Symmetry: D2
Subunit: 430 residues, 4 copies
């Protein structure tokens, strides 16, 4: 129904600078991660290189924002890249040179924005492109982000509000942006979902003339706005910021369950970025510092398995150049990636005693089953073929291990350690 | 496995005794409505004859309950039909004779039940079939319905709880019940959604060996439980009790918008019963008494048109034998019903200035467009073919009037009075 | 002091209550034994109420955990009655009169717990109401229960006969000689909030019954939003949910006292709940414990007594009195401390900072009382200046619990206090007095 | 008894406030004209505060609707200052000292409105805080705004300098001669609830400034949960959101008085808000009205005065005084009625039933005051027994507004009262 669905026919795959560099990534870091993606990941689908929040804040140095500071901005109230961090942006070029470089690697370019219009623009009353009202005249008088001071909300009832958002996506299209992650929009402790700005952004993107995939943040996303999200966004965060802590991974199981009927071509509920590999380099969030992910290998596989079968977008959050062989292997298993790319219909078959099973299928007769022990004790997790809707015996294969398991006549059953999972393909017997 | 979806491949259509007779319908009134349906309505899909709440309360005489009164019940804590109101239930036969009669007319039989176990069973500690525990041992000590005194909630953690629900659906299956409307389960001012009982009921149905369509009430249904409802129920009420008042009809537009992505084969968000024809005979609800519906003809058409394109179940709430020719005409237009039976993908194309357009399609390429003026002022309501996704000129037909309208080149546009609508079919031009 | 019933509780009620020791299950013999102990060791210090707590009408009660949907003992007018197995003197329809007589003969007063409403078994049978032709069924609220007890349904004040039922209850209680009623499921409720209309019906029933009956309301937390209602209708009302011998609950009470201090006055006492001292949990499993001596340390026990004393909470001892040791009894028989509860007024939090708190009050003879508390986890000096107390000159100081003169204080009071430890001090004039 | 600042408001403050007539936009000449009126006609009856309401620091203010995000008049120490265009005597950095001097010379007292916090522009420019090496930006809360005005950010009491900033504000206000401050965005907030920590900083700043400054808090509804806090820190606090000349809001006040009546006492006055009487809405558009005489009927006006009087709310006239008619003035100059406000105590609701309400209070000479109200839509007799008043014998009765003896009353007071009409009666011992 919505043309923009065609811009994300499978769930977006890429890298995002937040978990490794907070608000502070530099051009060289972005390029290095892009070069890695081009070389090792791109043939497996990984394509977006996304500069996360506050690329317009020259003094950013962490995940903790420096409040009330000046921001780089053009003459039409539009935030611009900090030239110290992004030297190719010198001379008002913005992100075009960086985006060109990324496109020349065969990749796509993404940016984070904060909902609204900068506070400094509203206080100074700087101009808006394409109208003779000033920034001050389109601001909401009662709309802020509770955890960041950069912006005020834009009031869609005001003349010039749509013009401002149109002008942002003109700029981003000029730069060659392919993806935008809009933040302080899905959930807010003070205000709830900013629905009207979502609609203004949808319209701005549709007018700018370029395919720009729309990601919305942060969660938890209310189901009450399911129709709005499904129709307007290509991806939307189910949860608040995800980190390498078991408790947050445990919690994702329920959110997937809650959102599974709204997953479909072009509109992807988002389990958030993958905190794998080397993270916390200039981020202090998640209760950690400079580290390798604190998820155990079992937890890492559990996460990948759930995000894969659910069909979350996959946005790697570590510094890619520091990946070891293990970490790279989580990204490049063709059999596993078939479930994400070509599976559909994912659903929770059951959840009982902290054992969970999910299943999906492809168009070729295969059924995929992800079985999870999300308890604190080792245990056998099982599911009958009848509960999967398989009426005959099936061949089983462990997709992560790439290992035939033989014929299964009645049930699948595996001993799984705490937080451990397995992903199995069932197919018709020979 | 959602095998129960197959029991409601299209949204259930039928008649329900609440709006005309409150809690107090008699066997004769049910039979008469069933005979009418067999004769005039069955070829158009109308098939369920549903006895609404409190068939077990011999003194019921209104929509206002008589609180704390004795209820008709068997020896296993199961409510039974009141023999004074349902004479064929003499001798412990329950509803089997009535259901047989209804089946012999080529129709299906439905009943209303209240969640839980009767308070009188708990207080007397009457037995539960198939166990040695008593009613008192399975009751929740803190679960009531705030607007009816008949039951206490059942506690799924107690031994015997599932046995009790299993026993209910064994009885209903013995009677030949094809449809159950379970109340005090979706929403509750005191407790929210009774999720655990929904699951016990799903299980009891699945175990009883007969196809029984599951309807849940009352709304508003939380979007947060969309997965649970979609997987467990065939229909669930979006709203608190719907009545012949413009305000409630106006409000339904938003609920349909909220629920539209969860509508699909086997699982139907429910806009509630149609307060058409002669209602309020022994009901005082909705702010009215014995009357013909207070919806104007335009309003009645507006309602039918929205429920049709949305694919709400259609449960007629008036005393059918008092239909006039106008009222019957709302129920026997095959061209309109096709949109309900075979349409899919219904969505709100836009809502602006209290003008609303919805569209859906069938697999044969027809596009259906419902255009609504829900404002207080006459106006032209229009929509471009482009916004419908039609890339060239089309022919249009008014489905209610059964009248070709000719070619449309750029936009559909009609003058519509306040609260008036039209339903149009678009197909390729010659 | 507009309301006549204020005169029935000029000082905050003091007594004993069966809940913390015996749950819902106390017997006549236990009640009498605690009364006898009170008469002989406590009565000269103001302890006078002997309160039979919840479910004296439930013959099979055996714990603090209620046995749901069981038969209850009741008369022919929908009124609950004492279980005769547990209260043998109630045989022959006499109810509590004999037990109350016995208590009155000791020079004490008698109290009972009731649950708001009318028994569900009355409403379902539709049993009669004294003094009217409507039945129990016709006065019940169709949407009013207690979420943690199944005995009753609420009564709907709009229905004819509702007031007659409550009047009839207090006619019964007056006939028995009841001097005190603790009405439960009325102040707070997870489902419904405060049952204001029933509070008013009960005020009226009491006023009509012709006997002075002190009205206690339970359970908390009491909303400040209903401060006026509570102040004008009740003699005491619970500030908190059930209090037990856990430091965390005692720590929390400091804030609730702060919140309620301006509504404390003659006849109308915010209630910090019963004192879980001595031997408790005999047939109670609440509070996370079983049969035990209170888990409060001695310091905690003093800290509790000190706050309740200066605050002017009602004092309802919750342990089985006959098992008191010397230490426990000493908490109850210090006249110098009790003077602060009986004759103090104006109690206020002077400050709270770094988990140090100081409260002060005074009497009409110009003595000033100061309670100082370390509610942190570390030993520390807690101090307060005379200026902050409003004392303009040097004062003599005395440690009321220790009964020990501390000498002259020129500028400030200051004491090293262990974690959870407190002190209660009296300040009186030095200028103008001999040496 | 305990708090020294109670002695600065031994009776409930009485005065005039510019909001209901001039919104945010009053001028020096308008203030001075109202003050002159007060001095001439009102001062002998207790009216003494002349209060300049919100946004005296916003030079372009022109209504009750704020002009968001505009630059504000401010000194080098992040402190808002009077707009010299509106207050010409403030020229040359003198602030409100000349105006306050003029007012004091009339035998009156001077009040100002402030918004909680520190100005956004000070935080963005990081202007200094007097007496310290920190800046405004170092003391601001990053998640604390007013939802209905854009001028300030909240101050974070945990930060070094925070107290110094509020101390500096009250040093300025004391230098000017301020005698009363109304602090807004502090009692209630849709986003954040009661700003309890800033109330305590303000209490402390006032206590340190060396001058008696009566502390009024706004806006309501004030939560009873914070009764202690308000009673101990403030001289008055708003029970309600902004009160206007609409029956519905007057009707609602009866319940708020009932809820707050036990916390009324010397020095600490729950506040039923300003009196929308006389000529209001001159440059205000709030309350659903424009330039007008109050839409309260005479009966409603009396009913309001009567409740505020017996309850002992502060009395802050909100109209342009110079346009009073003889009627309006009469509501302010009845000494017999005012005695109930000045010397009454113990006010309580005797009952409320069928939209009839009776309040009573007394004085120390044993007079008893009874206010009887018909707040229904129908004419009716409203009565109350002497027994319910606690009068154990017959009493003389006098209608205080009419100044008319009514004779001996043996058993009950009873009067036929129109809808929204009331009466105020004094009962005193017979012979």
């Amino acid at each position: 129904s919505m043309h923009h669905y065609q811009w994300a026919k499978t769930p977006p795959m890429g890298w995002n600078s937040w978990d490794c560099y907070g608000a502070s990534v530099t051009e060289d870091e972005v390029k290095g991660n892009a070069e890695y993606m081009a070389k090792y990941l791109k043939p497996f689908g990984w394509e977006y290189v996304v500069v996360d929040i506050q690329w317009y804040e020259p003094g950013a140095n962490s995940s903790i924002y420096r409040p009330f500071v000046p921001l780089e901005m053009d003459e039409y109230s539009r935030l611009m890249p900090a030239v110290n961090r992004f030297p190719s942006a010198k001379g008002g070029k913005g992100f075009k040179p960086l985006a060109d470089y990324i496109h020349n690697l065969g990749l796509k370019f993404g940016i984070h924005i904060m909902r609204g219009i900068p506070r400094q623009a509203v206080h100074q009353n700087t101009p808006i492109l394409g109208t003779n009202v000033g920034a001050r005249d389109i601001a909401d008088t009662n709309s802020i982000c509770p955890w960041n001071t950069d912006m005020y909300g834009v009031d869609h009832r005001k003349e010039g509000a749509q013009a401002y958002y149109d002008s942002l996506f003109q700029l981003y299209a000029q730069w060659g942006v392919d993806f935008v992650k809009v933040d302080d929009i899905v959930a807010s402790k003070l205000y709830g979902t900013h629905t009207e700005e979502i609609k203004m952004i949808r319209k701005a993107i549709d007018r700018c003339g370029r395919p720009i995939v729309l990601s919305l943040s942060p969660g938890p996303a209310p189901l009450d706005h399911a129709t709005l999200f499904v129709e307007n966004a290509n991806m939307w965060r189910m949860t608040d910021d995800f980190w390498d802590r078991w408790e947050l991974l445990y919690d994702m199981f329920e959110q997937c369950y809650k959102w599974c009927k709204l997953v479909g071509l072009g509109h992807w509920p988002d389990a958030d970025m993958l905190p794998l590999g080397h993270i916390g380099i200039r981020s202090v969030d998640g209760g950690g510092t400079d580290r390798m992910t604190r998820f155990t290998k079992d937890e890492q596989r559990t996460m990948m398995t759930l995000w894969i079968i659910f069909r979350s977008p996959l946005m790697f959050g570590g510094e890619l150049r520091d990946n070891d062989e293990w970490t790279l292997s989580l990204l490049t298993n063709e059999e596993v990636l078939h479930v994400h790319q070509n599976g559909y219909g994912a659903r929770q078959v059951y959840r009982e005693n902290d054992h969970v099973v999910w299943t999906s299928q492809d168009a070729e007769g295969n059924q995929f089953v992800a079985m999870f022990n999300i308890s604190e004790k080792r245990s056998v997790v099982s599911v009958s073929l009848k509960d999967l809707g398989c009426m005959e015996p099936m061949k089983a294969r462990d997709l992560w291990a790439k290992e035939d398991l033989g014929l299964v006549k009645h049930q699948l059953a595996f001993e799984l350690g705490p937080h451990q999972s397995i992903l199995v393909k069932l197919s018709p017997a020979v």
